[PDB]
Amino acid sequence: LANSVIDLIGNTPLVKINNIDTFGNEIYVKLEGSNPGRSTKDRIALKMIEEAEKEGLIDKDTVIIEATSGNTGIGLAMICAVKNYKLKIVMPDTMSIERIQLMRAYGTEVILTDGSLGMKACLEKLEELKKNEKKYFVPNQFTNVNNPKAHYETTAEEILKDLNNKVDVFICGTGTGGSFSGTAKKLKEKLPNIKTFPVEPASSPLLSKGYIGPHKIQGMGMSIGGIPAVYDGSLADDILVCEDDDAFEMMRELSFKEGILGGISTGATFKAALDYSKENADKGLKIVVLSTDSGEKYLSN
Amino acid sequence: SLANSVIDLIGNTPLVKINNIDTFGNEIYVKLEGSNPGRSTKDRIALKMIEEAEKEGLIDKDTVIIEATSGNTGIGLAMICAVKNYKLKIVMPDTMSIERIQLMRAYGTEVILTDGSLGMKACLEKLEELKKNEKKYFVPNQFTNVNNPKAHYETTAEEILKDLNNKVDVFICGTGTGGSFSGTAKKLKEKLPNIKTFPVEPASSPLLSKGYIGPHKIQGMGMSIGGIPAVYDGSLADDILVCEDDDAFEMMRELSFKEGILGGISTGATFKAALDYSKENADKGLKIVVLSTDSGEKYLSN
């Protein structure tokens, strides 16, 4: 028995790739779309809220407010439904309408900004929204240690346990950098020889080239006006990238060939991993790819 | 949770207690079949129908799988056929949530549509035409295949028994084929002879309770093949429960608002029928299990 959907967060499956040629290495996909809120962000939503509760920062009528590209808003929305907290989310208009559908299904209010101004514009609008709230809590996934700490405590430990401490490579898409950084931190503490790589959009190559641009790999990319504090670049063994169309194409390869329905970033992260496997062919590596969310919310895309 | 393929994620779904919505002094647990990798309970029947036909020698590498579905059986078949590399053709009514066609095509399915006004009967009739154009095929036929109710008899029911440590007073399940109701209820009544088991049908298509059909919006539920499906076993029904379209939508919304459970329209219908039952039997401490057939994401566009 689960006492609520909160008890279903985490413990997500790790699935082997069987039909796609992975070049003499084994690739496993950790399916964070299996979380009740359908993304890895259920983990950080829960930890940011639960630690804030313990620190006395959240009363029953505290309005939670967060800037998000969608999934952190959804995770927060589901958790706030269970906890009976009021949530307001600021997000860009460029993101999939299904993200909005999902947040509103849980009773969350959504405020929209111009997506051509990036997540920076979301954060600016959030400052305006604070002025009208008597009592609020901003989790701030861009700075909150409990974003990467969630992954350090659960996501990484699950990877280690399911693969019996035999993991050679971990590859993960980045937006805040929290899932990459928290998970890689724990993996590296337990497995000193593991290689860990972040992925970013080829069209928004901030970490690899020093500049941003518009891209279509929803959830990935860094658009707050700098590298987020929760991204730990020292963990990156190299920066991997993926083009927009290649990410969409790989999303369909995974669903057609493996029955894995992941999001656009899953396509991006998996393409990057498969390219890595190919460059490192026939080594017998155990490679883990984080799939951040499920593909159902991208059918309109 | 290391899996060899997504097929290994089918089943072992969670039972969640209802905490925030008033349940009138009985305990209601929802079995979340939306946790399946294909997002519905139909993954269980897709797997068993395919695996049994494989063992029978009815599916070779080049056998085309052909099925009539309202969506979820097609999605479950599509996901499994993607892993197994079988060619799948699905016939569905054009009146269902348009996420269904997209989901199915994402897995490689060929989707053929029939006039929704004609119901599933039109889908089944269209299969006759598809069969003439194929050298090798297998039709799972969820409406007649005993491996539909047997999948639930074998897995769904056992998980309910295990998770509640054989303490189950009432089981309430929505119907379309009637397979999830009938297979689960059969097992439960074998192990617990005092358990009450109830199917739910749409109030505006009350075939079982009033002997006629009509239009309804509770996608996946209702019986529109031109009679009661062979896999429905009405001898298991302690009563027939119903739900109106508006109440099903209202309760779908209340579940997501108050419990963070995003179930489909039929989950709203089944849960509403369960709440009505629990109110009629208020404060008896009954342990009531409601099967949530699918998750709600595919309905949120309308």
Ligand SMILES: Cc1ncc(COP(=O)(O)O)c(CN[C@@H](CSC[C@H](N)C(=O)O)C(=O)O)c1O
């Ligand atoms: C979302 C949803 N809820 C309930 C059901 C009913 O489950 P059982 O079939 O009774 O185990 C379904 C099943 N959907 C089937 C079609 S059932 C027949 C049609 N409703 C009809 O004759 O009109 C499917 O996915 O094909 C379901 O999907």
Ligand SMILES: *N[C@@H](CSC[C@H](N)C(=O)O)C(=O)O
């Ligand atoms: N996936 C996150 C957002 S990460 C940062 C964003 N991609 C950016 O452009 O800065 C979420 O909010 O769900």
Ligand SMILES: [Ca+2]
């Ligand atoms: Ca306080």
Ligand SMILES: [Ca+2]
């Ligand atoms: Ca609310």
Ligand SMILES: [Ca+2]
């Ligand atoms: Ca160490």
Ligand SMILES: [Ca+2]
């Ligand atoms: Ca190193």
Ligand SMILES: [Ca+2]
């Ligand atoms: Ca390209």
Ligand SMILES: [Ca+2]
């Ligand atoms: Ca199994």
Ligand SMILES: [Ca+2]
């Ligand atoms: Ca009471």
Ligand SMILES: [Ca+2]
């Ligand atoms: Ca045999």
Ligand SMILES: [Ca+2]
């Ligand atoms: Ca195929």
Ligand SMILES: [Ca+2]
């Ligand atoms: Ca095909």
Ligand SMILES: [Ca+2]
């Ligand atoms: Ca009514």
Ligand SMILES: [Ca+2]
């Ligand atoms: Ca809608």
